């Protein structure tokens, strides 16, 4: 129930990456999500690799690398893989390659993974309150989320079937309007720093609430 939370400032989200031309912002929005997991149990702040899910989650959890994914089947293949490694030992390519895991680099590990009702922008506040950042979709196939510098983005003809794989980490107002905060992954030039805030209460303003995940990691 805080009106505002920025996980950032609890220390719990590493630098903004740049998928580039590999669609792999599934693999972005899950590291993230798990990062923050990470950096709660242990106190240490590290980037997870994207990469590492690009090339090993792949057709067993349903997903095809630069051409998409879930965030909820990449938790599972870490899940399954008992791991995933570092970004700094397994770092982002932007393309399609072999899996190289190697458990001798394993940075976390992930116990299980939660995923919330559609639609619902009450119980996805309460989770970025109570648990920490949340994987979720947008529905970014609007010129105005390219174009988007600052503010409190609003979309008329946004949807809410979800298209782009982004990181809710936040919450909050600017002067009565209502905002999510969410961590993009189109570098640092991108919005806010890399950061968009989206319209919060309106109807699941381009999908944002459709389908939320975040993971865990336990004692
Ligand atoms: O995660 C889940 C749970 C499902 C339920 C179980 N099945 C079974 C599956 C099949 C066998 C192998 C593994 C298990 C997969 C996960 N959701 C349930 C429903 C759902 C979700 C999303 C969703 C969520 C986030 C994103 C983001 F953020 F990336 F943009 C996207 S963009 C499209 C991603 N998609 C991934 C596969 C292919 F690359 C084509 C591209 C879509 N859309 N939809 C509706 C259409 C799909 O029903 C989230």
Redesign the pocket.
Known sequence: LPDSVDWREKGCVTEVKYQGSCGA??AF?AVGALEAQLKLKTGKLVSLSAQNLVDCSTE?????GC???????AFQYIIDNKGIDSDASYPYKAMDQKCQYDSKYRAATCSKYT?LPYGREDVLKEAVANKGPVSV?VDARHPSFFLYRSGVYYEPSCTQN????VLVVGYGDLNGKEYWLVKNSWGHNFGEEGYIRMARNKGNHCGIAS?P?YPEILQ
């Open positions: 912002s599934w929005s067993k959890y349903g997903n095809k051409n998409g994914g879930f965030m909820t089947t995923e979709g979800v298209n782009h794989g389908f995940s």
